[PDB]
Design a protein around this ligand. Structure first.
Ligand SMILES: C=Cc1cc(F)c(CN2CC[C@](CC#N)(n3cc(C(N)=O)c(NC(=O)OC)n3)[C@H](F)C2)cc1O
Length: 286
């Protein structure tokens, strides 16, 4: 028996956990014994279509996640082969986006900063292994417990070539533009420092308990105009070049806001590092 080999005949679909353009993530029970006692798992699969081989990308995502081992990175469980399905642990609390709005009374600033540290430890591990995530947002941060988060999705993750500072693409811009650094929006280049920018926006989300009326998309559209359509991104790049940033979350101490501002230095080289963030948060927690 290979315990990472999940037979289709035993993998029972329960419900959708999410959708994207090219695929979905479903709650399944792997129930070899057929009595509903099998373990619940999360299952990423492509909708039958995926031309610009989404299959090749999913296979590379599976290979990335199989070889990540960190307590703040969602666990690989295995595959289901037919087309292929990525099986992961199921975290029934879901993302910070579903959990924080329901648990503000539970999650105070101290716990928010611990979650901030744990995201940074995840992200520093992925950086150490020469990857750029390119999609760091609260919707991609899963709640293991009141005390623990894990980065839960690697759909856009890429290897930076050895002796390169960044990864270029212009694949499929369903891009999360309200999470992206200017060098990402302007020149489709992604540095580790780009994920640090993305982390500052995710920190803002965590500090606003992912309220939809304070979302980075809501607040940016207020700054530039909810109009604009095909002009949005320029207008956003314009806003950033003028030095405009997301405002301090209500009740966020200036010293936390100042760590978030260091994520948002226009030049990648001018940005804080994940290691420095962990230090600044740990300082604030003592
Ligand atoms: C084909 C590509 C593709 C498809 C997609 F649907 C998504 C979108 N997506 C990612 C995984 C997601 C969020 C995270 N992190 N999630 C994982 C779990 C879990 N493992 O338990 C979970 N739990 C949950 O909601 O519990 C109530 N949510 C959620 F499914 C959304 C991204 C993609 O690249």
């Amino acid at each position: 028996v290979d315990p990472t080999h999940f037979e289709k005949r035993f993998l029972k679909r329960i419900r959708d956990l999410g959708e994207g353009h090219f695929g979905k993530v479903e709650l399944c029970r792997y129930d070899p014994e057929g009595d509903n006692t099998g373990e619940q798992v999360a299952v990423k699969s492509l909708k039958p279509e995926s031309g610009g081989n989404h299959i090749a990308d999913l296979k590379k995502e599976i290979e990335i996640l199989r070889n990540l081992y960190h307590e703040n990175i969602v666990k690989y469980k295995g595959i289901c082969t037919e087309g292929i399905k990525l099986i992961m642990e199921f975290l029934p609390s879901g993302s910070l986006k579903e959990y924080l709005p329901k648990n503000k009374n539970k999650i105070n600033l101290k716990q928010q900063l611990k979650y901030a540290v744990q995201i940074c430890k995840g992200m520093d591990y992925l950086g150490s292994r020469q990857y750029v995530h390119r999609d760091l947002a609260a919707r991609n941060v899963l709640v293991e417990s009141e005390h623990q988060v894990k980065i839960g999705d690697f759909g856009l993750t890429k290897a930076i070539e050895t002796d390169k500072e960044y990864y270029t693409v212009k694949d499929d811009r369903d891009s999360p533009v309200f999470w992206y650094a200017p060098e990402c929006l302007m020149q489709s280049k992604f540095y580790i420092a780009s994920d640090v920018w993305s982390f500052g926006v995710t920190l803002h989300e965590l500090l606003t308990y992912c309220d939809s009326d304070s979302s980075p998309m809501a607040l940016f559209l207020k700054m530039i105009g909810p109009t604009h359509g095909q002009m949005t991104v320029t207008r956003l790049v314009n806003t950033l070049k003028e030095g405009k940033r997301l405002p301090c979350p209500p009740n966020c101490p200036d010293e936390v806001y100042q760590l978030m501002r260091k994520c948002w230095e226009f030049q990648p080289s001018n940005r804080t590092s994940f290691q420095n963030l962990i230090e600044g948060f740990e300082a604030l927690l003592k």
